[PDB]
């Protein structure tokens, strides 16, 4: 597929090949996050801070409940037939929605059945006195309640209820609640325009528990095969399925997906190396990561994906199309690969692949430790390939490295290469280039007229 020799001749040394993994088939676990601590053992030093906190929490959580009740009030069972589906929505009442919003509303309706069971023993949720409490949602299924600031109350305010003045304890509780709200509002504030969607990661949701998502995940339990890869790739998400404005808690359905490896698909990394052309230094402007799926070459938004040693883990398919010119550039037509001048002094000048060293020896002093003499790059050579057929041991300054053998052509350093057009990648320079060729095109059209 990709012509790695010609790409390496223009400074694109092939790198590690990684697999493509996408999340799928999530399992659901319900948790309760109570956003107000139990101050029953400290009520003499409560004062009026908890009423103001309750008012502030009600103001914060009212829009979330109002946005949930749009889909709560307009989704029901299908009484016509269940041959095709069993969830009936009223599209007129909802009015404007996306595919993701509709799917999330469906999932919310499915989770309503367990939310109704968790809504029982609400007095048991209101009476929790520990940071993590387990109760019985059903006779065979348990539910975990996490209280937002219960450890601070239990170990910082209650044991010092007599050693310091009660007003100081009240003030410290007030600042604790205010700091909790300050942390929470970055996530659960007006930025939570769409609480229906299930793209909210567990890290963001755990801001209602003070940022402690490790406690939630560990208490719930998980499969440890790919747990860190699932967690770091924003794949473990959650959805708010119920908000209580009397007891001040929310019910969150956490999704634990699995990682499916996309078959006959991989991602190739290209290490960029500066090369020499006409007494100047250049770097090729191509994508660093290329996704090859079923012998189809395309780009990938690797900034949203987790890159590991062996595979690239993403929560969704991030493939984007590629121009035919760049596709032809990656398959051997090096005359179509753009290049940019190097004016910075800090750029990669050599790389290693399969024990073979591709180095720009015009700009760095590469020598052979076997003989002690420097290795020469001519003015017509973009890069130098060094292996143990000509220099078994190469020194590039402070490092002496033994080299393997090249599996490509034996005439790598003698064959020529076609070089593509120079470019400039600055946004202002992009606008300037567009202006220049627009004016030139207008002049050409004026000559045509």
């Amino acid at each position, epitope marked *: 597929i990709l012509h790695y020799e010609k790409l390496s001749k223009i400074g694109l040394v092939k790198g590690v090949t990684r697999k493509y993994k996408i999340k799928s088939n999530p399992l659901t676990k319900d948790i309760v996050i109570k956003m107000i601590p139990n101050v029953s053992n400290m009520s003499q030093c409560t004062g009026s801070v908890m009423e103001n906190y309750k008012t502030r929490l009600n103001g914060i959580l009212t829009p979330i409940k109002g946005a949930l009740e749009i889909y709560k009030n307009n989704t029901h069972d299908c009484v016509g037939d269940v041959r095709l589906a069993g969830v009936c929505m009223a599209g007129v009442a909802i009015g404007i929605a996306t595919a993701a919003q509709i799917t999330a509303g469906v999932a919310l309706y499915e989770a309503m059945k367990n939310a109704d069971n968790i809504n029982k023993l609400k007095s048991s949720i209101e009476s929790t006195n520990e940071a993590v409490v387990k109760l019985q949602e059903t006779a065979e299924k348990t539910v975990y309640v996490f209280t937002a600031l219960q450890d601070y109350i239990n170990t910082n305010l209650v044991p010092t209820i007599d050693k310091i003045p009660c007003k100081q304890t009240e003030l410290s509780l007030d600042l604790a609640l205010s700091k909790y709200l300050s942390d929470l509002l970055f996530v659960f504030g007006p930025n939570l325009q769409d609480p229906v969607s299930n793209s909210m990661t567990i890290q963001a949701i755990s801001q209602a528990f003070g940022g402690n998502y490790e406690t939630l995940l560990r208490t719930l339990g998980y499969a440890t095969e790919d747990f860190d890869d699932l967690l770091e790739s924003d794949s473990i998400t959650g959805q708010i399925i119920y908000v209580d404005l009397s007891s001040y808690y929310i019910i969150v359905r956490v999704y634990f997906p699995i990682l499916t490896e996309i078959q006959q698909a991989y991602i190739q990394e290209l290490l960029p190396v500066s090369f020499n052309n006409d007494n100047s230094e250049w770097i090729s402007i191509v994508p660093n990561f290329i996704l090859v799926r079923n012998t189809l070459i395309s780009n990938i938004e690797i900034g949203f994906c987790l890159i590991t040693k062996r595979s690239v883990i993403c929560n969704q398919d991030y493939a984007t199309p590629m121009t035919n010119n760049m596709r032809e550039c990656l398959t051997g037509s090096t005359e179509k690969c753009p290049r940019e001048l190097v004016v910075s002094s800090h750029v990669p000048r050599f790389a290693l692949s399969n024990g073979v060293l591709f180095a720009n020896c015009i700009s760095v002093t590469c*020598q*052979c430790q*076997t*003989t*002690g*003499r*420097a*290795i*020469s790059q001519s003015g017509e050579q973009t890069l130098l390939m060094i292996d143990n*057929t*000509t*220099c078994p041991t190469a020194v590039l300054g402070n490092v002496i490295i033994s080299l393997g053998k090249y599996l490509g052509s034996v005439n790598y350093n003698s064959e020529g290469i076609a070089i593509g057009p120079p470019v400039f990648t600055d946004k202002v320079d992009i606008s300037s280039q567009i202006s220049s060729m627009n004016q030139s095109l207008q002049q050409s059209k004026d000559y045509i007229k």
Partner: antibody, heavy 120, light 106 residues
Framework: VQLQQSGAELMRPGASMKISCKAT????????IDWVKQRPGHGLEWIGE????????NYNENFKGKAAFTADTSSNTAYMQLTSLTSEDSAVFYC??????????????WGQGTTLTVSS | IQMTQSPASLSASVGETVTITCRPS??????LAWYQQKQGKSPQLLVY???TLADGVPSRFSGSASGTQFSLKINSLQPEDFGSYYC?????????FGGGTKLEIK
């Protein structure tokens, strides 16, 4: 390109030599100057090499310390200094023009050879 | 890296094709040179890369590499080809010359 050596000399054991090789017709500071030994009946033997200008030197392990190399770019002359002459140093010494870079160790041009005689 | 050069001495007639081989103790790849020396004169570079002739050397001489061993061929030998022939690797430090094949015009 011509390499001109010093004349033949007779030295007592324990003395020293400063063999000179003047190079004309090319950039002296670019090409390595190699030094080769040849005693009669035992074939040629590579003494070492020096890169003039940069001062880089490479030494044969059987001759390191016994021989030293120096370069004078102003007069374009290479020098080999031999210390503690013995009966084994009675040989013909050549200065040769090596390559500039790695893999070019063949000797393009040679001097006529300075014949050293050593006797008690 | 030692050189085993064959034959140690050889006598050939005028116009006869002759071959002198030398085997390094290790693989030196392309890097090998053949020099010719006569009595009382400095050696002259005949071949500088295993199959490449030097400037001023007539096309009568030729060099060949068989991977493991290297050889020098003289076609239509002439009386001025008498002397000694040496081979050098210049692959690694120190550079090692061959034993020296003595060719005498028969």
């Amino acid at each position: 390109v011509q390499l001109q050596q010093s004349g033949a000399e007779l030295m007592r054991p324990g003395a020293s030599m400063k063999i000179s090789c003047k190079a004309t017709g090319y950039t002296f500071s670019s090409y390595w100057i190699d030094w080769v030994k040849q005693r009669p009946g035992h074939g040629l033997e590579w003494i070492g090499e020096i890169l003039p200008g940069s001062g880089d030197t490479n030494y044969n392990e059987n001759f390191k310390g016994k021989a030293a190399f120096t370069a004078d770019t102003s007069s374009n002359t290479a020098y080999m200094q031999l210390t503690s002459l013995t009966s084994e140093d009675s040989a013909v010494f050549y200065c040769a023009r090596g390559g500039r870079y790695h893999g070019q160790g063949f000797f393009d041009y040679w001097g006529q050879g300075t014949t050293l005689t050593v006797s008690s | 890296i030692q050189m085993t050069q064959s034959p140690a001495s050889l006598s050939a007639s005028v116009g006869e094709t002759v071959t002198i081989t030398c085997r390094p103790s290790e693989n030196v790849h392309i890097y090998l040179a053949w020099y010719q020396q006569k009595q009382g004169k400095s050696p002259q570079l005949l071949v500088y890369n295993a199959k490449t002739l030097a400037d001023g050397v007539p096309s009568r001489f030729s060099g060949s590499a068989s991977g493991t061993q290297f050889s020098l061929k003289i076609n239509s030998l002439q009386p001025e080809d008498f002397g000694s022939y040496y081979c050098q690797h210049f692959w690694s430090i120190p550079y090692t010359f061959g034993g020296g094949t003595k060719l005498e015009i028969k």
